[PDB]
Amino acid sequence: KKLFLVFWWHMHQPLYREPYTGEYLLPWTFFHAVKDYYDMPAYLKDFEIKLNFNLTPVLIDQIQEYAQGKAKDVFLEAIRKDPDDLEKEEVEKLIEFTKLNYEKPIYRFERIRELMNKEKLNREELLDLQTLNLLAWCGRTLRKDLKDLLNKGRNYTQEEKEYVLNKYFEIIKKTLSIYREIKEEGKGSVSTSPYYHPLIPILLNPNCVYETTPNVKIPDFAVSFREDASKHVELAKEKYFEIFGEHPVYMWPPEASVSNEALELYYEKGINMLATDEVILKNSVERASPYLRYYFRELISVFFRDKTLSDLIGFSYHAWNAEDAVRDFIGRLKKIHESVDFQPVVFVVLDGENCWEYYEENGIPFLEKLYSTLEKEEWIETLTLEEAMRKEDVKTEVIESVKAGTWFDGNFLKWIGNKEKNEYWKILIEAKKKAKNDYILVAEGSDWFWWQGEEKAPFVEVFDKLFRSFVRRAQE
């Protein structure tokens, strides 16, 4: 009797490329590429387990632009320059960026503490500020290769900074290749999402928000987004085809969002399996275990992720010591294993790049211990998405209807329903009336609405600038 374990790491960035200047207005794609997008599948070189990945098409587009040397990244330019060449505005961006990231464990360099304590920085001090911002995002592979420079922690030269930059771009250039390789070697499956990561159930039918939040106020959806919902899925299939040579059969629905209409669309588009969230399952059927493979109307296969295990990694374990965290997680798996006669399928699905910066040492002690432990547990079998989809010795059940929702509380309130988020939908609705090109699809991405009308929102003015630029470009 085995427990089947399925990791599915979701990787995504909205488009930071301003359409009129071509400049990347935030560096987050660059920094998550050098820290997470190569290194997460690269664990499979060292550990004999299966790990699965979702890559959104808009993320793939940007990785390609960086790897080709075409990304005009404004924050990265302030890092690369000799400090004597920095504009006053660029120094201010560097300090601002440091300040935002300052409390993250990956920024735990004594020299950063000293630099942010100085009234003004000379050329040598700015060289350190630039280089330590780069090194803070060093991924697992180069933390071993560049170990000597990392332990330096201060006194960086322009030549050392440029050397680190060159190694980082090497990592980016190898990123799509590592995904093809782990896919071809059978170490993992690779999925994609509708192209710009939109909320497909809202595009198909805005009134689906009233399935879970009857009191929410939404704007007048005076235009149809149904054809755009189809286009997101179709263009995603073409982009995945271009990278991997075949059409995708697995998709990750953005925000785990599903509805009856969305499931039908994925089915009509040839998708064979997706996953969603445990809260959706609980809202949709009275009694339902998440350890079964489900069949929606006998049209498409659905797994419901284990929300507890997924949230422990994604939100809890950064606050734990690495060994205790792994012991806790293995112990929960043991309880699941002992709780049923059949062989359960346990889906662990979460963002693949966002939690690690809050762990000690970028989550590397945690993940190395977790994977090293999992690979020697004889009663656990990690599975690719393809293996999970075809596994015969598993329990299954047919479901006829789901209640629309997302993995955030089972509902859509993080993207619609307050004044500021509703203003964005009205802008999109009015723009959709006059849209002339596919930049209207870019503005349909979920990220723009997520940051609107929120308290934190680092660089929300940049996201607002991007959203409104795409909305303006779509009408020309």
Ligand X SMILES: OC[C@H]1O[C@H](O[C@H]2[C@H](O)[C@@H](O)[C@@H](O[C@H]3[C@H](O)[C@@H](O)[C@@H](O)O[C@@H]3CO)O[C@@H]2CO)[C@H](O)[C@@H](O)[C@@H]1O
Task: Give bridge partners of residue 399 from the DSSP assignment.
Answer: 296
Choose between 36 and 127: whose C-beta lies nearer to ligand X: 36
Cβ at position 100, least distance to ligand X in Å: 8
57-67 vs 226-244: helix crossing angle, rounded to 10: 40
Cβ at position 198, least distance to ligand X in Å: 11
Regarding 191 and contact with ligand X (CB under 6 A), the answer is no
Cβ at position 462, least distance to ligand X in Å: 8
Of 292, 299, 391, nearest in space to 347 by CA:
292
- Whole-angstrom Cα distance, residue 129 to residue 155? 10
Compute the chain's Rg from CA coordinates.
23
CA torsion angle 39 41 44 45 (round to 10) = -50
Cβ at position 286, least distance to ligand X in Å: 29
Of 30, 131, 227, nearest in space to 235 by CA:
227
Choose between 13 and 131: whose C-beta lies nearer to ligand X: 13
Identify whether the C-beta of residue 129 lies closer than 8 Å to the C-beta of residue 155: no
Which residues in the chain are immediately followed by a break of C to N over 2.5 Å? none
Part of the chain binding ligand X (CB under 6 A), chosen from 114-122, 304-312, 365-373, 444-452: 444-452
Cβ at position 343, least distance to ligand X in Å: 29
Cβ at position 231, least distance to ligand X in Å: 20
Identify whether the C-beta of residue 246 lies closer than 8 Å to the C-beta of residue 190: no
Task: Give bridge partners of residue 396 from the DSSP assignment.
Answer: 293
Task: Please identify which residue in 19, 360, 450, 453 interacts with ligand X, judged by CB under 6 A.
Answer: 450
Regarding 12 and contact with ligand X (CB under 6 A), the answer is yes
Task: Please identify which residue in 221, 320, 358, 459 interacts with ligand X, judged by CB under 6 A.
Answer: 459
Pull the structure tokens for residue 110: 């004594």
> Which of positions 347-376 make contact with ligand X (CB under 6 A)?
351, 353-354
Choose between 293 and 414: whose C-beta lies nearer to ligand X: 414
Task: Please identify which residue in 5, 7, 13, 309 interacts with ligand X, judged by CB under 6 A.
Answer: 13
Regarding 257 and contact with ligand X (CB under 6 A), the answer is no
Q: In the stretch 24-43, what mask flags binding to ligand X with x, by CB under 6 A?
A: ----x---x-----------
Q: Sign of torsion, CA 274 372 182 68? A: positive
Identify whether the C-beta of residue 421 lies closer than 8 Å to the C-beta of residue 449: yes
Choose between 163 and 450: whose C-beta lies nearer to ligand X: 450
Cβ at position 344, least distance to ligand X in Å: 25
- Whole-angstrom Cα distance, residue 132 to residue 108? 10
Part of the chain binding ligand X (CB under 6 A), chosen from 156-164, 297-305, 423-431, 445-453: 445-453
Site for ligand X, rule CB under 6 A = 10, 12-14, 28, 32, 351, 353-354, 446-447, 450, 458-459
